[PDB]
Each structure stands twice: as structure tokens, then as C-alpha cells.
Design a protein around this ligand. Structure first.
Ligand SMILES: Cc1cc2nc3c(=O)[nH]c(=O)nc-3n(C[C@H](O)[C@H](O)[C@H](O)COP(=O)(O)OP(=O)(O)OC[C@H]3O[C@@H](n4cnc5c(N)ncnc54)[C@H](O)[C@@H]3O)c2cc1C
Ligand SMILES: [Zn+2]
Length: 261
């Protein structure tokens, strides 16, 4: 059964140790430091809030945590954003985060200049969500949700079937993934269209025959793009949490979208 487990909250200050520019618009960052003690991540969509410096003020507000709650979400000067735990290696003591590099916000702009020695406040994960096994996983993701989708794919048993549709800017943004045998992974290219302005994921889903066996559909990406995907799944009688999950990670014209509500 679908199960939530909470983690204890603590304010961590971590430092960039490795930077890997894996594709032109994505940078993979390993964060470390003694604060990483006690950090946990059990599932593919686990995410932290990263707390960034202000590039203009030089100000850098970090999380304040007291009695298992963050106290300063509404303090002035804070810049926090949700990012996926791409990988967590407890023995290496390193937290890996994949950042989309874009110019529209401070998280994207920080990623563009990320280098060893940069530090970030790291809050969470608040907890983790376990799912029962499925026979066939259908995954849809634009670049903000690709880290979680890729983590999922690489953690699947070799027996699993996968059908994945990943929307990226162009062919140079494709990644080589360690997927189960026979996985079907399709890279969809915006080819000049701006992020969040196409219906490429919906169109791919519409062309996909519902597979055999126990199926789970997971979609993440731009909130408005996901609305017709949610509707399509529900109209075929599928139930949120059991048959699918659809999670808006960002939304055009909105800064720091809260995906909880
Ligand atoms: C659970 C969760 C997990 C996430 N994991 C990741 C992750 O692993 N990697 C990752 O890159 N993102 C991830 N995101 C998305 C990320 O939180 C947003 O993209 C966030 O808005 C980026 O912060 P920002 O400061 O760059 O710009 P913001 O200040 O939040 O937004 C400024 C403007 O830029 C736009 N914008 C925001 N993101 C993008 C984008 N990627 N491309 C184009 N325009 C954008 C906004 O619509 C807004 O107009 C995740 C979201 C959630 C909810
Ligand atoms: Zn969350």
C-alpha cells in the first residue's frame, strides 16, 4: 500500500564538492559537509528545499528550524526552492542534485555559476513516499522532473517494464540512463519552443496504449501542461495515489510554486 514516512527536520549547511555539466542546460552538483550526517532519502521523488544567496545583496538567509518546524519561510530575503534528491550516497556522504540551468530565476542563475566551495542551506526532505510495486511504469517528465524520473528508472528491478517520455530542449539534452532491459525511452524535443509552452507530453500519452499488468503512471513538470494529463487519466477511471501521480513542479509566470497546495 502507498505509505508516507516523515523525517526529522534539520537545517543543514552544505558545500559544493563536485560540479558535472552533464548536458548544455543541466548541471549535476554533489553537496557535502559534516551537516550531512543523519540525512535520509528512501524514494525517487524525495526533495529538499535549497536556500540560496542573494546575488545582489550578498545576503544569504539559511533555514531556522525549531521543534521540527522551519520558522522563517516568510522572513525577508529568503530564497528557497524545491529540488530533487537525484542521488544520496551515505558512505560517500554526498548529496547529488540536478539543476536546470535557465535565466528566469535565482535557482537557475545560481546553477549556471555553480562551483566547488559554493554553499547552500539544505532543508528536508520533510519525508518520503513509498509505493507498491508495479509491472509497468509509465513516466512523463519535462527537465524539472527528469531527475526524479531518472532516479526511478535507475532503481527499478531488471524485470520491470518502462515506458518513458521526457521533454527536453533538443537532442543535446538527452541523457544515457541505466534502465531495465527493454525499457522504452522517448526523448521529445521542443526545438525552439519555450519551456512550458508545448503539449508534447500530453500528445505522447494520448498515443500510448494502456499496457498489460499492474500499471503505474507518473508525470511531473509544468503545472498547466499537466492538467490535461491528470484529466485524461481520471477519465479512464484511474485513481490518484493508486494508479497515478501527477505533480506540478513549476508553472510559467509563477516564482517558487508550492506543489503542496
Ligand atoms: C518536488 C519538486 C522537485 C523539483 N525538483 C527539481 C530538480 O531536481 N531540478 C530542477 O531543476 N528543478 C526542480 N524543480 C523545479 C524547481 O523547483 C523550479 O523550477 C523553480 O522555480 C526554480 O527556481 P528558480 O529560482 O530558478 O526560479 P523561480 O524564481 O521559482 O521562477 C522564476 C520564473 O522562472 C520560471 N521558471 C522556473 N523554473 C523554470 C525552468 N526550469 N525553466 C524555465 N523557466 C522556469 C518561473 O515560471 C518563473 O516565471 C522541482 C519542483 C518540485 C515541486
Ligand atoms: Zn514537497
Amino acid at each position: 500500500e502507498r505509505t508516507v514516512e516523515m523525517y526529522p527536520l534539520k537545517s543543514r549547511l552544505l558545500e559544493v564538492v563536485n560540479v558535472r555539466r552533464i548536458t548544455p542546460r543541466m548541471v549535476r552538483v554533489d553537496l557535502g559537509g559534516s551537516d550531512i550526517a543523519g540525512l535520509r532519502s528512501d524514494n525517487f521523488a524525495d526533495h529538499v528545499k535549497l536556500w540560496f544567496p542573494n546575488p545582489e545583496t550578498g545576503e544569504h538567509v539559511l533555514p531556522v528550524v525549531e521543534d521540527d518546524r522551519c520558522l522563517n519561510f516568510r522572513a525577508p530575503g529568503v530564497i528557497y526552492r524545491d529540488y530533487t534528491v537525484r542521488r544520496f550516497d551515505a558512505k560517500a556522504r554526498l548529496l547529488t542534485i540536478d539543476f536546470v540551468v535557465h535565466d528566469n530565476g535565482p535557482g537557475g542563475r545560481w546553477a549556471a555559476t555553480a562551483q566547488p566551495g559554493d554553499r547552500l542551506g539544505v532543508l528536508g526532505p520533510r519525508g518520503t513516499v513509498y509505493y507498491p510495486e508495479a509491472d509497468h511504469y509509465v513516466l512523463l517528465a519535462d527537465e524539472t522532473a527528469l531527475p526524479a524520473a531518472a532516479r526511478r528508472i535507475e532503481e527499478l528491478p531488471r524485470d520491470a517494464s518502462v515506458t518513458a517520455f521526457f521533454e527536453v530542449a533538443d537532442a543535446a539534452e538527452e541523457q544515457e540512463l541505466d534502465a531495465p532491459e527493454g525499457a522504452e525511452i522517448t526523448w521529445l524535443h521542443r526545438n525552439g519552443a519555450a519551456p512550458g509552452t508545448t503539449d508534447l507530453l500530453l500528445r505522447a500519452l494520448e498515443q500510448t496504449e494502456f499496457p498489460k499488468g499492474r500499471v503505474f503512471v507518473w508525470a511531473g513538470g509544468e503545472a498547466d501542461a499537466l492538467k490535461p494529463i491528470r484529466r485524461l487519466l481520471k477519465e479512464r477511471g484511474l485513481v490518484r495515489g493508486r494508479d497515478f501521480e501527477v505533480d506540478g513542479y513549476w508553472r510559467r509566470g509563477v516564482s517558487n510554486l508550492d506543489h503542496h497546495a
